[PDB]
Ligand binder design. Structure first.
Ligand SMILES: Nc1ncnc2c1ncn2[C@@H]1O[C@H](COP(=O)(O)OP(=O)(O)O)[C@@H](O)[C@H]1O
Ligand SMILES: [Cl-]
Ligand SMILES: [Cl-]
Ligand SMILES: [Cl-]
Ligand SMILES: [Cl-]
Ligand SMILES: [Cl-]
Ligand SMILES: [Cl-]
Ligand SMILES: [Mg+2]
Ligand SMILES: [Pt+2]
Length: 165
């Protein structure tokens, strides 16, 4: 099982804390989005456009289930994975770290146009707040550890987790 599975909104730090936490532990980081693009060969966007939500989530759950069983390092879960009941079920029993972030800080951490589908240019703040209202209850439901990252620098978040593992 993974040493830790990181979940949270876009910009909460899943990729960043994931990479840094994995390095600290001397283990590897597996990003479900990356695993999906490498399993299929197509990009996230392409899968959504062609196949669409339902098909994506299905491929995603499949990748997530294999990761939870085969990966022993740090696992960073795609932000919408928890919307799938099957994923929430698969997570039961694992160490799940919910990286919490405010909407104001979250929207600002993701302003780099690093490909944020759900956060289209027009009124990103409103969209981000809506995303939070929808996803937060789910992250809270699957989390075994909650970590506020609002005023904590990345290294502090990593040390916080490391000390609790
Ligand atoms: N604790 C933090 N303090 C300051 N900036 C952070 C922190 N965590 C993440 N960030 C920054 O916010 C951006 C989004 O981080 P990222 O790991 O890609 O988030 P996610 O994978 O959850 O979408 C990155 O540029 C990252 O360096
Ligand atoms: Cl995300
Ligand atoms: Cl399973
Ligand atoms: Cl590993
Ligand atoms: Cl299960
Ligand atoms: Cl909000
Ligand atoms: Cl909130
Ligand atoms: Mg990520
Ligand atoms: Pt909120």
């Amino acid at each position: 099982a993974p040493k830790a599975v990181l979940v949270g909104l876009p910009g909460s730090g899943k990729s960043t804390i994931g990479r840094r936490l994995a390095k600290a532990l001397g283990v590897g980081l597996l990003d479900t989005d990356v695993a999906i693009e490498q399993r299929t060969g197509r990009s996230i966007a392409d899968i959504f456009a062609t196949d669409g939500e339902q098909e994506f989530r299905r491929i995603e759950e499949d990748v997530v289930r294999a990761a939870l069983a085969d990966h022993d390092g740090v696992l960073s879960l795609g932000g919408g994975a928890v919307t799938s009941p099957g994923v929430r079920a698969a997570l039961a029993g694992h160490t799940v770290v919910y990286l919490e972030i405010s909407a104001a800080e979250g929207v600002r951490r993701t302003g780099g146009n690093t490909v944020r589908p759900l956060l289209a240019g027009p009124d990103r703040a409103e969209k981000y707040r809506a995303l939070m209202a929808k996803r937060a209850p789910l992250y809270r439901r699957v989390a075994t550890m909650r970590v506020d990252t609002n005023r904590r620098n990345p290294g502090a978040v990593v040390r916080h987790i490391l000390s609790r593992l």
